[PDB]
Short mmCIF file of N, CA, C and O and ligand atoms in Angstrom, two decimals:
data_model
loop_
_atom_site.label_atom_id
_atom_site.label_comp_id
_atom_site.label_asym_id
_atom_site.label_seq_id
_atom_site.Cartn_x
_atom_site.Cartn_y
_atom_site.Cartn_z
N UNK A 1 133.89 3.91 219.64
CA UNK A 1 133.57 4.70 220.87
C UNK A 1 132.58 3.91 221.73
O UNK A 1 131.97 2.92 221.32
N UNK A 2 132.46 4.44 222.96
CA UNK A 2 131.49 3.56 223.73
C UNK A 2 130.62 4.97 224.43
O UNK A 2 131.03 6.11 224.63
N UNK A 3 129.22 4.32 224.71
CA UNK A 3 128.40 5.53 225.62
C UNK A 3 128.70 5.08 226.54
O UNK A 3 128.79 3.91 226.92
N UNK A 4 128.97 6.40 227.18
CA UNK A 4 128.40 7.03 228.73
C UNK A 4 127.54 6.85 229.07
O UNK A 4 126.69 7.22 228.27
N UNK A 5 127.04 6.32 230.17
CA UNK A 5 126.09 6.49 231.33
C UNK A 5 126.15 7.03 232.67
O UNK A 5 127.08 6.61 233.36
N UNK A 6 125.20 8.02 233.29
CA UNK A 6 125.50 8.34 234.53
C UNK A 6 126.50 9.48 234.68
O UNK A 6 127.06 9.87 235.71
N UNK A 7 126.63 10.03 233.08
CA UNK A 7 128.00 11.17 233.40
C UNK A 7 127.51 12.16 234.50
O UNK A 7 126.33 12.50 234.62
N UNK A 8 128.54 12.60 235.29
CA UNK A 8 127.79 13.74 236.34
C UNK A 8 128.11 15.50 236.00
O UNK A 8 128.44 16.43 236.74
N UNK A 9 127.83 15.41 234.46
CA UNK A 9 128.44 16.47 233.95
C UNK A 9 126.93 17.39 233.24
O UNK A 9 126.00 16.61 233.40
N UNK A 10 126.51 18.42 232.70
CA UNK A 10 126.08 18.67 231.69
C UNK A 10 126.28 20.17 231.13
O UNK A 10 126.79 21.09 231.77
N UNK A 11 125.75 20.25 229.68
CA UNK A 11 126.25 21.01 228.87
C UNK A 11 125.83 22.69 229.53
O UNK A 11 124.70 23.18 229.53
N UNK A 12 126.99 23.28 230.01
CA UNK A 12 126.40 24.56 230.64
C UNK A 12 126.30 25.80 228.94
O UNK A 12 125.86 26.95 229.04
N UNK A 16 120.17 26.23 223.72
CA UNK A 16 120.23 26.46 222.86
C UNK A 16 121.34 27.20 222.64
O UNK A 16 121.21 28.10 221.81
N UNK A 17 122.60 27.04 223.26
CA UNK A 17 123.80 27.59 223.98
C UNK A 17 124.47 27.01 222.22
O UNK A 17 125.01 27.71 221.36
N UNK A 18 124.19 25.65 222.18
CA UNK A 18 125.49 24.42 221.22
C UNK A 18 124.46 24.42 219.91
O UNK A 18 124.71 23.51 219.12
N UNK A 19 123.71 25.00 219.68
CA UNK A 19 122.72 24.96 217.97
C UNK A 19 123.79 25.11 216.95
O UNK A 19 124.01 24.27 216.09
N UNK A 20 124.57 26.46 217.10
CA UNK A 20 125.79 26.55 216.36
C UNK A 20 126.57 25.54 216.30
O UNK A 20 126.58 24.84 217.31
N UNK A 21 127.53 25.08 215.09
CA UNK A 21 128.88 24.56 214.88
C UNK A 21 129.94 25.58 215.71
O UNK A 21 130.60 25.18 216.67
N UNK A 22 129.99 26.67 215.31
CA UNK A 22 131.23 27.62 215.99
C UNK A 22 130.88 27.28 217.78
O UNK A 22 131.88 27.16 218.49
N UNK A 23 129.61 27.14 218.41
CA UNK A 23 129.81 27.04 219.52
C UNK A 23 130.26 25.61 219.66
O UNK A 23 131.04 25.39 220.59
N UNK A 24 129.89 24.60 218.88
CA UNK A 24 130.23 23.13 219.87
C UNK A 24 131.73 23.19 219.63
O UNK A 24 132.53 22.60 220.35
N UNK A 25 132.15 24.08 218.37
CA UNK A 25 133.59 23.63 217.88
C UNK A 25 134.38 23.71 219.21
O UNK A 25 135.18 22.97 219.78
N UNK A 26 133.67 25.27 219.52
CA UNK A 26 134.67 26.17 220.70
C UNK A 26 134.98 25.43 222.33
O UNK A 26 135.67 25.78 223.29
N UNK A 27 134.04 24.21 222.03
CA UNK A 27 134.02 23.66 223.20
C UNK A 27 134.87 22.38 223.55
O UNK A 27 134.79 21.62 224.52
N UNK A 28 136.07 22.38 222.03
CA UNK A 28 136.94 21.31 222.01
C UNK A 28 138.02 21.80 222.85
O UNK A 28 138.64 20.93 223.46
N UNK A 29 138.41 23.12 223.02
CA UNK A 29 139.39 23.94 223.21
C UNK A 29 140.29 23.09 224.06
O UNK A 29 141.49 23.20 223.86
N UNK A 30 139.89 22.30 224.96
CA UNK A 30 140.32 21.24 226.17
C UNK A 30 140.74 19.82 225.82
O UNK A 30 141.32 19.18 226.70
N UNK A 31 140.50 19.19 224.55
CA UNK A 31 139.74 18.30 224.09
C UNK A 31 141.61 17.30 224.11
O UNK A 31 142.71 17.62 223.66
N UNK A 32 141.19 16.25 224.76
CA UNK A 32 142.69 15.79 225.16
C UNK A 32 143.81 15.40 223.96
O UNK A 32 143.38 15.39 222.80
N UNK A 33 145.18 15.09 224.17
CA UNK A 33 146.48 14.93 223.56
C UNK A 33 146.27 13.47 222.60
O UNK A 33 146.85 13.30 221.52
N UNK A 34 145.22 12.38 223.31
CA UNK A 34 145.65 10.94 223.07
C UNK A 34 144.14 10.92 222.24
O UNK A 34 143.61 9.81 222.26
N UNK A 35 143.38 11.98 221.50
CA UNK A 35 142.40 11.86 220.96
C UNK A 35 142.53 13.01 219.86
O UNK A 35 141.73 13.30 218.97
N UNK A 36 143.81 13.61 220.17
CA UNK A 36 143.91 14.50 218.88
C UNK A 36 143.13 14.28 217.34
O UNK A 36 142.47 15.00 216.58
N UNK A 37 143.63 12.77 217.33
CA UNK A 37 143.49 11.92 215.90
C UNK A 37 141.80 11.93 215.74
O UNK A 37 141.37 12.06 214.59
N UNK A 38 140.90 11.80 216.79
CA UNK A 38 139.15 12.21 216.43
C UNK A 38 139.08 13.51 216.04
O UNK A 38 138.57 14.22 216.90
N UNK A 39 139.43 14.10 214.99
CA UNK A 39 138.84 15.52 214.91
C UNK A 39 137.76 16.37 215.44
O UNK A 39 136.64 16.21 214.96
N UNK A 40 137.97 17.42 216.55
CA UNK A 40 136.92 17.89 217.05
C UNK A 40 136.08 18.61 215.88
O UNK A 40 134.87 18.83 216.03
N UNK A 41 136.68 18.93 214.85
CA UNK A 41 135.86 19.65 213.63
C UNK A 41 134.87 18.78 213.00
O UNK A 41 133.90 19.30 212.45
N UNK A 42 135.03 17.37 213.02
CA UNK A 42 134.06 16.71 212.17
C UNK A 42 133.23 16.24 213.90
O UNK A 42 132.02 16.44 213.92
N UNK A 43 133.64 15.87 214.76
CA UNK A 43 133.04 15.97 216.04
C UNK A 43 131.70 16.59 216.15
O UNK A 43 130.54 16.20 216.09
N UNK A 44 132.38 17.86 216.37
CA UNK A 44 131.01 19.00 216.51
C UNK A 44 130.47 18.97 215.12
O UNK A 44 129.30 18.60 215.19
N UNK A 45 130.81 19.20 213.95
CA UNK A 45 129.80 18.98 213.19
C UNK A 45 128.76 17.81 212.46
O UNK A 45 127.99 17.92 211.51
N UNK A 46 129.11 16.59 213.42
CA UNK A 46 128.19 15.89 213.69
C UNK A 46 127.02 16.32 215.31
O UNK A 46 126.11 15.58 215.68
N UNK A 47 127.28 17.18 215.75
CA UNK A 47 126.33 17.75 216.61
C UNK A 47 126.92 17.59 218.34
O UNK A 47 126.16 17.88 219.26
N UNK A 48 128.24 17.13 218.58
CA UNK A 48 128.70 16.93 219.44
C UNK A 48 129.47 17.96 220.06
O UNK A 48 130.30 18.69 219.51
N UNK A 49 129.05 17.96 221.49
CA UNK A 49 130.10 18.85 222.54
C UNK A 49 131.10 18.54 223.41
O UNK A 49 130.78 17.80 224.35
N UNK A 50 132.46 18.97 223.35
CA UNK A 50 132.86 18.20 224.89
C UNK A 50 132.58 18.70 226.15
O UNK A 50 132.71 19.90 226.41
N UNK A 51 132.09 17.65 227.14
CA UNK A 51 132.21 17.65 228.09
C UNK A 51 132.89 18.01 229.37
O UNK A 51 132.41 18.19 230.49
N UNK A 52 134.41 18.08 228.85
CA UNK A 52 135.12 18.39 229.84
C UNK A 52 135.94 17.19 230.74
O UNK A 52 136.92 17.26 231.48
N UNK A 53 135.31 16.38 230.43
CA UNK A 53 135.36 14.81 231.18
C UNK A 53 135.72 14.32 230.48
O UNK A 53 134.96 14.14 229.53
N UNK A 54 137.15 13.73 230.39
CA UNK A 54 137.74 12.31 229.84
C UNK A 54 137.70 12.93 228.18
O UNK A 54 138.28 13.98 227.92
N UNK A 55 137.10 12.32 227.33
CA UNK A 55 137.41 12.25 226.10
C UNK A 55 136.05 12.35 225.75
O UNK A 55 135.86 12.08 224.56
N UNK A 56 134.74 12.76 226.60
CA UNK A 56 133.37 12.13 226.94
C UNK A 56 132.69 13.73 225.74
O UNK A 56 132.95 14.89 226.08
N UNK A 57 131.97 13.45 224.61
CA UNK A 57 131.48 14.01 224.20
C UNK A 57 129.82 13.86 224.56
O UNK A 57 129.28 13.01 225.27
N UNK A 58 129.34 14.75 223.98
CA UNK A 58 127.44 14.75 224.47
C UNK A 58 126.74 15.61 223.32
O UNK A 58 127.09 16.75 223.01
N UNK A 59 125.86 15.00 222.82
CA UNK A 59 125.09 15.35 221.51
C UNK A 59 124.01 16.78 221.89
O UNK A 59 123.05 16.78 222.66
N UNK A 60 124.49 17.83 221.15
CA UNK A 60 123.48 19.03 221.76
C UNK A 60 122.14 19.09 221.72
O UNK A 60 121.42 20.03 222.07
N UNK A 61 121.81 17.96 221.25
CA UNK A 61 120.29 17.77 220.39
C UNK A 61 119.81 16.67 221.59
O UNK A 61 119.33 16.93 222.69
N UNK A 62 120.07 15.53 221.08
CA UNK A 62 119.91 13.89 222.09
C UNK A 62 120.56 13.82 223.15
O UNK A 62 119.99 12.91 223.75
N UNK A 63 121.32 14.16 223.75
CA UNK A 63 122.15 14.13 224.98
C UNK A 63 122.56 13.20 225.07
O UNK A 63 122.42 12.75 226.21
N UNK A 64 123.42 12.13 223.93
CA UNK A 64 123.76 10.89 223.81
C UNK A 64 124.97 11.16 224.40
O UNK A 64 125.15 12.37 224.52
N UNK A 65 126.25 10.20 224.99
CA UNK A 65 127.34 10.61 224.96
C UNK A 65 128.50 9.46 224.83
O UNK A 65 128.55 8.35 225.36
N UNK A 66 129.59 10.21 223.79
CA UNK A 66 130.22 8.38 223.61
C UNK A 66 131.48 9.32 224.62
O UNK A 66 131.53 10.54 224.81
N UNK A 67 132.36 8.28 225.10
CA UNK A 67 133.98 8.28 225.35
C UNK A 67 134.56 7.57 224.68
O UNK A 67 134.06 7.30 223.59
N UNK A 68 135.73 7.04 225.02
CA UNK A 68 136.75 5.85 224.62
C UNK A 68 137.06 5.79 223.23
O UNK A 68 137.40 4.73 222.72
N UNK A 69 136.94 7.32 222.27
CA UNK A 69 137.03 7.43 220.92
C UNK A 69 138.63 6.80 220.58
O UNK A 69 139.72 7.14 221.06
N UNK A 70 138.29 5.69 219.53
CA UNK A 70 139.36 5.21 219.15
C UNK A 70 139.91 5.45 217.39
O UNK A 70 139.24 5.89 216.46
N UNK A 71 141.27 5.00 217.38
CA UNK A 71 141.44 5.42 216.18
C UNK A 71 140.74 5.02 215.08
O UNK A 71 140.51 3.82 215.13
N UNK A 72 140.22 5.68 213.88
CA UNK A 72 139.28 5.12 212.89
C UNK A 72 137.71 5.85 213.41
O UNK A 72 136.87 6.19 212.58
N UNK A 73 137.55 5.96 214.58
CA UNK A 73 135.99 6.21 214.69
C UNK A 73 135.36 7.43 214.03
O UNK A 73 135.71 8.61 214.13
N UNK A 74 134.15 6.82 213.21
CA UNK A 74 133.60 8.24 212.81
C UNK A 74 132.29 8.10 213.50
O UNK A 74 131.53 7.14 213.65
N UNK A 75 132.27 9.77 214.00
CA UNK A 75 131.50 10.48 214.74
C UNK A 75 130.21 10.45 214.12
O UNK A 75 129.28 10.57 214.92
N UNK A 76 129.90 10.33 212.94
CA UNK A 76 128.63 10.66 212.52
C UNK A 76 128.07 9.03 212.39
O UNK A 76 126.86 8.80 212.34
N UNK A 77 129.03 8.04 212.34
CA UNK A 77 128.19 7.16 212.48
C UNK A 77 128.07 6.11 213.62
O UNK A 77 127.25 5.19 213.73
N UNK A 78 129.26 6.55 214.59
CA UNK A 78 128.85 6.77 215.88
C UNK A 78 127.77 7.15 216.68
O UNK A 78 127.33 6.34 217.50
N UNK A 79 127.34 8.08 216.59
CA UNK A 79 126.05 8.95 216.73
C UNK A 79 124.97 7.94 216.14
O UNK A 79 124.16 7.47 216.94
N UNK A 80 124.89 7.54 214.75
CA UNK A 80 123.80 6.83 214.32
C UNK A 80 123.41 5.62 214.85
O UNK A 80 122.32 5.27 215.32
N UNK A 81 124.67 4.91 214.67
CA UNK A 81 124.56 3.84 215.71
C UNK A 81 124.20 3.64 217.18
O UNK A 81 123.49 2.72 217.56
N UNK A 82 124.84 4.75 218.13
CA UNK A 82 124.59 4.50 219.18
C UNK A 82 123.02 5.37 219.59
O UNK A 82 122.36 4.86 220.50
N UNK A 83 122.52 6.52 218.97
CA UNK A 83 121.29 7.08 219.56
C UNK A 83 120.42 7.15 218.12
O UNK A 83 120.25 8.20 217.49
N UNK A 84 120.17 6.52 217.92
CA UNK A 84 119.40 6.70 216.33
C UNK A 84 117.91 7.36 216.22
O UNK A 84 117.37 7.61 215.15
N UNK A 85 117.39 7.56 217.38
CA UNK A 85 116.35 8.62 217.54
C UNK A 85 116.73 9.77 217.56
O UNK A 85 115.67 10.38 217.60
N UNK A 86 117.78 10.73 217.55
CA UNK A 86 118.18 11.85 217.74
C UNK A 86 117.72 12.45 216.80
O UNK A 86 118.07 12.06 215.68
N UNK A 87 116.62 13.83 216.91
CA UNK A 87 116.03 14.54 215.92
C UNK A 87 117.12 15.13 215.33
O UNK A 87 117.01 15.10 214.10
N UNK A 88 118.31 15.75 215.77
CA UNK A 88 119.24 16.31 214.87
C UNK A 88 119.86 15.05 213.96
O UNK A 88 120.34 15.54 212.94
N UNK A 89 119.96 14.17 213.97
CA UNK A 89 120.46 13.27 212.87
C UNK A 89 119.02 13.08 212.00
O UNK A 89 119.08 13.13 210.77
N UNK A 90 117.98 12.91 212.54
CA UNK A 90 116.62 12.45 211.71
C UNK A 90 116.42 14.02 210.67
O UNK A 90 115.80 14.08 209.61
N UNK A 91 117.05 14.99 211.27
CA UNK A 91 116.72 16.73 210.21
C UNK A 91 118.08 15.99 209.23
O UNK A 91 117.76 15.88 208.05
N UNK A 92 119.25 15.56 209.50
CA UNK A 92 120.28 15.14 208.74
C UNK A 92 119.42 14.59 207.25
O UNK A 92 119.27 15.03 206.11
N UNK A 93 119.10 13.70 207.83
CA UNK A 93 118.84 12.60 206.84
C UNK A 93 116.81 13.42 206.36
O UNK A 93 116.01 12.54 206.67
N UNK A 94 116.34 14.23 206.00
CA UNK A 94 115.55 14.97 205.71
C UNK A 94 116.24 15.12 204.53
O UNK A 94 117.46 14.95 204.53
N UNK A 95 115.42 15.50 203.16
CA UNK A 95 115.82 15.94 202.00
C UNK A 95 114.55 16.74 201.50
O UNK A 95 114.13 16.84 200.35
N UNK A 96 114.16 17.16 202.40
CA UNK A 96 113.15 18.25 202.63
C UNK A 96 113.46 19.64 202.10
O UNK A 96 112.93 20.21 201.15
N UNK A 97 114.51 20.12 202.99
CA UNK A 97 115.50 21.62 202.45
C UNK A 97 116.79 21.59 201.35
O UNK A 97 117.74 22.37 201.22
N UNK A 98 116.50 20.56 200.73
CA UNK A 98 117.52 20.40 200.01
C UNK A 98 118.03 20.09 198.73
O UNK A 98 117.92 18.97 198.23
N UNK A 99 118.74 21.33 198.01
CA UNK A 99 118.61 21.24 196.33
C UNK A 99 119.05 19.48 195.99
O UNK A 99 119.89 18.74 196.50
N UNK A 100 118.21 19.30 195.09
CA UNK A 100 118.32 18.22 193.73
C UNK A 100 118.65 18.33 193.10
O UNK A 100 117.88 19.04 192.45
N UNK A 101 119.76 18.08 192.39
CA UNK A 101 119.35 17.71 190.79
C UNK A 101 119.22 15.86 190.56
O UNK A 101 119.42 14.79 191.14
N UNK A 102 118.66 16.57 189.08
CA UNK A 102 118.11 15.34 188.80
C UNK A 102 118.46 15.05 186.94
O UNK A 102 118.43 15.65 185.86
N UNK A 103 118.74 13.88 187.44
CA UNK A 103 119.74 13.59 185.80
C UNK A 103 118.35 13.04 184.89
O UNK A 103 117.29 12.75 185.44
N UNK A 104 118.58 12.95 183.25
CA UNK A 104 117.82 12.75 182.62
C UNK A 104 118.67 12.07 181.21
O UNK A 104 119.70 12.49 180.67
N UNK A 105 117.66 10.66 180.78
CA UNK A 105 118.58 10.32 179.54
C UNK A 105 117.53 10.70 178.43
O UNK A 105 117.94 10.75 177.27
N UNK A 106 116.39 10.93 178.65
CA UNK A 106 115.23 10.91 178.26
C UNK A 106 115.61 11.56 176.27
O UNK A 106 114.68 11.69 175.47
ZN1 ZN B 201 122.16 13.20 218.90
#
């Protein structure tokens, strides 16, 4: 995928939800079917409305030109890697452990 710059679009605490960014594929074009808007938005992404042009509800990053193979979540990492919603991702703060033992 490649970012956007200069999109003249924006997202009309609306997209916090998954069910809302999902709902916002509804448009989401024929020749990008193959990017799943389900793993899309649940990497934190909305569409736009524009082109193929997604936008991060958190960072306001935005890639287009999603090609076959691209994953969204490391898309996202790569291209905006300050984004507090990927930095809560990678947190293991809220999150069960286990923990193995040979002891
Ligand atoms: Zn982001």
């Amino acid at each position: 995928s490649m970012r956007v710059k200069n999109l003249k679009s924006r997202l009309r605490m609306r997209y916090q939800e998954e069910e809302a960014r999902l709902a916002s594929f509804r448009n989401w074009p024929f020749y990008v079917q193959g990017i799943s808007p389900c793993v899309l938005s649940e990497a934190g992404f909305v569409f736009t409305g524009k082109q193929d042009t997604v936008q991060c509800f958190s960072c306001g990053g935005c890639l287009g030109n999603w090609e076959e193979g691209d994953d969204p979540w490391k898309e996202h990492a790569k291209w905006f890697p300050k984004c507090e919603f990927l930095r809560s991702k990678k947190s293991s703060e809220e999150i069960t452990q286990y923990i193995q033992s040979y002891k």
